[PDB]
Amino acid sequence: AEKEEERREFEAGIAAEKNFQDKIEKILSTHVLPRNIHPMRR
Amino acid sequence: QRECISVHVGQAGVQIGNACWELYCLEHGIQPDGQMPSDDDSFNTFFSETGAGKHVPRAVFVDLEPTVIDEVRTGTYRQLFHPEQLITGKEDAANNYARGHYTIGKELIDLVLDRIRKLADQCTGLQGFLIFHSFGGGTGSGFTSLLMERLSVDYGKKSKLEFSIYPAPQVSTAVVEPYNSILTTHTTLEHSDCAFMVDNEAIYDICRRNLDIERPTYTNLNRLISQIVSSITASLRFDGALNVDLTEFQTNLVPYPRIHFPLATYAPVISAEKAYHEQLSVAEITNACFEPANQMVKCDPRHGKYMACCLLYRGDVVPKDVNAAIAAIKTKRSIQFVDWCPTGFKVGINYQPPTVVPGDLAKVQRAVCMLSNTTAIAEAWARLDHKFDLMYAKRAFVHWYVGEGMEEGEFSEAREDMAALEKDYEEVGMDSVE
Amino acid sequence: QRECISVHVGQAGVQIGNACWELYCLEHGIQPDGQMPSDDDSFNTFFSETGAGKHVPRAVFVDLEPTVIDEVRTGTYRQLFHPEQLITGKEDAANNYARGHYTIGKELIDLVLDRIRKLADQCTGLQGFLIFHSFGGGTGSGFTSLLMERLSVDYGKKSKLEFSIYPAPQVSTAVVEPYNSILTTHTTLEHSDCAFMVDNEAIYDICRRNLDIERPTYTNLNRLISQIVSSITASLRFDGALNVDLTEFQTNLVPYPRIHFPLATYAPVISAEKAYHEQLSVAEITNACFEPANQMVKCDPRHGKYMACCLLYRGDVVPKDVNAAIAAIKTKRSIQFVDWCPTGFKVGINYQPPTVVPGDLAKVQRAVCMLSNTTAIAEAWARLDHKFDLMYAKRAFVHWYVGEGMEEGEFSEAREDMAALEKDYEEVGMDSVE
Amino acid sequence: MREIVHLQAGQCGNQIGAKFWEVISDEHGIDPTGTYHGDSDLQLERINVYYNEATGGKYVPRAVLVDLEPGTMDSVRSGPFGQIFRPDNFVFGQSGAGNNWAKGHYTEGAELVDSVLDVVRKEAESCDCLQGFQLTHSLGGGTGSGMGTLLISKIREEYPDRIMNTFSVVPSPKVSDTVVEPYNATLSVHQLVENTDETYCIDNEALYDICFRTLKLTTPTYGDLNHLVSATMSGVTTCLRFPGQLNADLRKLAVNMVPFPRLHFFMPGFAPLTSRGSQQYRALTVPELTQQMFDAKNMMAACDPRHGRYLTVAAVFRGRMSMKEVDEQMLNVQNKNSSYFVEWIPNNVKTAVCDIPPRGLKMSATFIGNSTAIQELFKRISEQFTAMFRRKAFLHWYTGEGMDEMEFTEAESNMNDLGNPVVTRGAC
Amino acid sequence: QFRECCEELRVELFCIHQKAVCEERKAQIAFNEELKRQKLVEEQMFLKLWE
Amino acid sequence: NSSNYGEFLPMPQFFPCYYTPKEQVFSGHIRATGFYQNNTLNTTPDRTRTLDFPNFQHTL
Ligand SMILES: Nc1nc2c(ncn2[C@@H]2O[C@H](COP(=O)(O)OP(=O)(O)OP(=O)(O)O)[C@@H](O)[C@H]2O)c(=O)[nH]1
Ligand SMILES: Nc1nc2c(ncn2[C@@H]2O[C@H](COP(=O)(O)OP(=O)(O)OP(=O)(O)O)[C@@H](O)[C@H]2O)c(=O)[nH]1
Ligand SMILES: Nc1nc2c(ncn2[C@@H]2O[C@H](COP(=O)(O)OP(=O)(O)O)[C@@H](O)[C@H]2O)c(=O)[nH]1
Hints:
Organism (chain F): Sus scrofa
Largest sheet of chain A: none
Bound molecules: guanosine-5'-triphosphate, guanosine-5'-diphosphate
Oligomer: part of a larger assembly
Subcellular location (chain A): Cell projection, Cilium
Subunit structure (chain F): Microtubule inner protein component of sperm flagellar doublet microtubules. Interacts with CFAP53, ODAD1 and ODAD3; the interactions link the outer dynein arms docking complex (ODA-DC) to the internal microtubule inner proteins (MIP) in cilium axoneme.
Subcellular location (chain F): Cytoplasm, Cytoskeleton, Cilium axoneme
Largest interface: B-D, 40 and 37 residues
Protein name (chain F): Piercer of microtubule wall 2
Radius of gyration of chain F: 32 Å
């Protein structure tokens, strides 16, 4: 058990890393609250 | 909630302000007329709001002579300004400090204080005043000092930052320049609270050598000053990692109560067809600040010691890249600091890339103004002293002043006061031996 | 990290710089303007990735005559350098070491030194200030003098290679060329590191035989000199089995601290229709490296000994075939080596194959740059002294140098130390008898 | 059931406390809106130590947010957990603090201290059994030093039997974001001697040192800095929040950790600290946790422990771990490093092993150490103050606001009399 | 809250902002070149007035 | 020359790229509406050390 449990936690950490990478690419896709742009643009 | 009243006295002040307001307008986004584009609290720092979308500024343009206010009232900014804030005289102060201070001051000073009072009534917390002028003619000097006395009477607990054009140290453009300049130095030592020096010839040289403009004009000379004033008083306009206040500039740059004459510099004065070739990183923009050919005053810092330097970073700047730059610059033995101040640096961070006016400067991602209170300004002070002594050896050009009404003793009082300034600068100059 | 500025001073240098850079780029990748055409971290050393993924050069083309430097800021590579980088003067240094270490120079020297500062503040491990300067036309001699000295002071232990071009045996394109040399080696013998001297007379001879080119021009020579400078600085900008940085050259070639004057000789300098007939095998290339009719300085190796030779191979070089070559050489009796240097030559192997600028040097999958502190450069050193003597004899072409500074003494003072160099050579070649 | 009120003073204090509230909100499972979305009932079992109950489960943090500049709490409320505090806790006023201790202690700061204290009162009698108060501030500069010390004095004279935990950002040697840091910090340290119970000094230099050397981070920003402060900020108070064996609250740490009533200055430390690239090359366990914990490169204050004797130390471990590991490696670190530990105070380690680990990790450990390396930190800024004070510089604003020349000499004499006991403990 | 702490968001923001700076500099270069054309037209005008 | 100071109408590609503001609406609608003042009569319960509402069963 303490083995299978340890292996399960390691796999959870790898899957979390993968999800972080997909999330980072999605949020770097192109992302701009109108307030962050002075009337000059809008 | 935090705002400052901008006063421009004389052609110099009016024109610095011309550039000053054009820049402020652009930064915020306000259009010429005053109405905003088809649509924030930043407008509260310099403008107001009439409840109709016509931001009007907290500006008092005073000149004893027209055509310099009439250019403003005729040009494209006739509707940004309140049509009566632009106070116009009827007789030029005539490069006469004591005409602007003794005879033609009383036909206008009541109106000017009335408008300062009206602007300060619409103020929640007044962080201070910004007095823009020269150390030159009567409009720039005498009316300025006569204004400073009344604001010391009426606003004695209020901050008054000052931006002044020091006389050109080598050539100049008038012959009573040292007379007027030492008189306004004597009358603004005890009333002005932090007065930034700007020399013309330093702007001249930095425009010729860094801006790649072999034809610079006054439309550029204080177009740079508009940038540097905005970079000073923008930390209360935006947020930052290390936001700095107008009282923080004073409490971190004027160590003794009389030493309130810092010299400034701007960072990236790069020239559009020149910035495709540099990192413009924090370390090298700080090195470009401390390099002795980018100052605002023609004075060599190597003949003196730095006492307090405030760096104002605006743009995408990392405070620990600032840490690295300061750690690099404090190891060089050429830049000498005073020993009664083991750390003499202020850092200010603002998340705002600088606005660029259509013209000479290119925009950059990072820009710092470095405000240093150096002991090397005593060289310029003593050079102006030798200038005045050489002219005053035989009462040249004194008959105009004593005929209009200034007494003979005010010149000797100004001489003794600025010689005391010399002695104070030497006294903070030498090290501790006890 | 890996870094090495290139301070090309004088026409020969600037001109050669043009060649050296053209080669650096085509080899690394930078396009004429830059912006790596791309689709890894080589550039870093002899370049600087600025913003926008740019690639700026690490150089400072200095020369007190517009002509040359101007033809760079108006041709192919008028985008790589940042204007400021290339500093130019107004009046020429009319063949006069005087105009250098003395007049027309006291001025420009200040800036070039400041520009050298920034080009080295954006770095992290300056592995050598490679300075390319001829030994004739004032500039190349005088200007270099001032530079070398200043650098030696500020940038101390930092290496300072100087691919100077040695004066010529016969030919020669200056009747004052002699004077400058015996006044320029009084500064490359006391403020330098490993000045690789190359004579123009040899590249001439080689271009005729091996390169086949019957009448190539200057560019053709400077281009061969590029392959050599390249090979030297290739282990610090690419990979290798047995690398060798600039520091290793200095702590392996120079024996006593005043014989820093080695000679170089490229490898396969074959010519297209002639290379398709040879095997350019490692041995074959080194067999030619020590040949007496390919050394890049007329000085013949037969009438001399080899204090310590350095061999930097490039391209397909099995690291167990060089030991073969070095043995198949040390075995011979013609090549003689000072007894005081048991170990023979130091091997250097890099994979990056010599690139080819569509011009002369054809495609050879291997090569080697051979350096050596031959005990026979004395021959040339002596030829020089005779000229200085025959000329100072009737104090000729001296009124000039003494009218533009240089007290008459210099010539005498220096010529003595030049003869001191002679003894040093005929002293380290003496056969250990104790 | 126990109880702690969070004071935040100054810009640095407000930002570090905001990161603290974000960290423990995500630990307890509280969303930004205040509602509860968690997975374990132990999170809700002891939630009302930092989090006052409201109508329907919108738990409100019991922190006051104080500055003389009405600009930083606006950023706090616009931040990623802004909409969770009570708006009556936000107290401010447009004035120029001006990084000035006199202006934070004898003027507009002393104007606002009464209105601050009213909210501190209301949150203090809205309690069941208050352990005490916990002020986050920066010693260098004003507001956090001036009003922070004035608030500490007033709270100590109001409730004198409660534990005061002041997390202070002490000025660093290498750089200085303001120029009057010795001036502010000698007075604030003088006031922190005979008021507080647990000071925690954090240098910014050590923050960037653990950001670069250990974290291997390229552009470490102020958010990550305050996050590293918030890690130990949260980890010190975990046995009053979560179950586990060998529980330890703030007063148990204090009695177990301050020998003489002046030497209550502490060096925090959080050390399961690995980079993203070095995480997978690791065999995370209690021996290695002790290795990074007692290593001098995961420290949070720029003071090297190897130029002083450890007076006493705690490790607040968290996680499902065996205790023979922590017991035997505390014994082994005491036996390996003996000259750096005092001999007149034996068994000078503390172990407290809470059960719940922080999110994203299986075991963690918070380091508290009363090293005699505070010697250099005090002596250095004593030297800087004496250099700035012999020549009578940067002080006319203080005398204008109403200081006396004698008070600065009192503060410097008291801070030197704080540096004297740390001399004596280094040589018995 | 994920915007404010990832550090690759911040690096990639450096990248986008530098690209925007470069393109904006190009627009400025075009504008200043247009200023140069306007000055040349001014010079031709003053030439023909002089003649 | 003073006409240069309002000329060259702003293009939609001249401004700085982003605008990070300091918006005081929170302070704006808090400051005028008080800073809270404890002007009340106390309602705190009879708090004891550890025996709030105890039991006195041990007696005759
Ligand atoms: N940017 C800018 N600076 C100016 C301008 N006009 C004057 N200055 C500065 O002002 C200095 C001279 O100021 P004064 O002597 O007071 O000139 P004045 O007020 O017009 O004096 P009068 O002839 O009596 O009208 C010059 O040396 C300039 O540096 C301007 O139009 N633009
Ligand atoms: N590779 C190469 N060498 C050159 C070239 N031109 C001149 N040289 C060498 O340079 C020597 C003299 O030229 P320089 O020293 O560069 O003359 P300079 O730098 O113009 O100095 P001044 O005449 O005072 O201006 C000659 O003896 C040549 O051997 C060239 O175009 N290419
Ligand atoms: N860790 C951390 N330190 C900060 C932060 N903001 C400011 N500081 C530090 O606080 C010091 C000065 O702050 P201070 O002058 O006291 O701000 P004030 O209280 O408003 O006057 C600086 O040296 C900063 O390094 C933050 O968000 N996190």
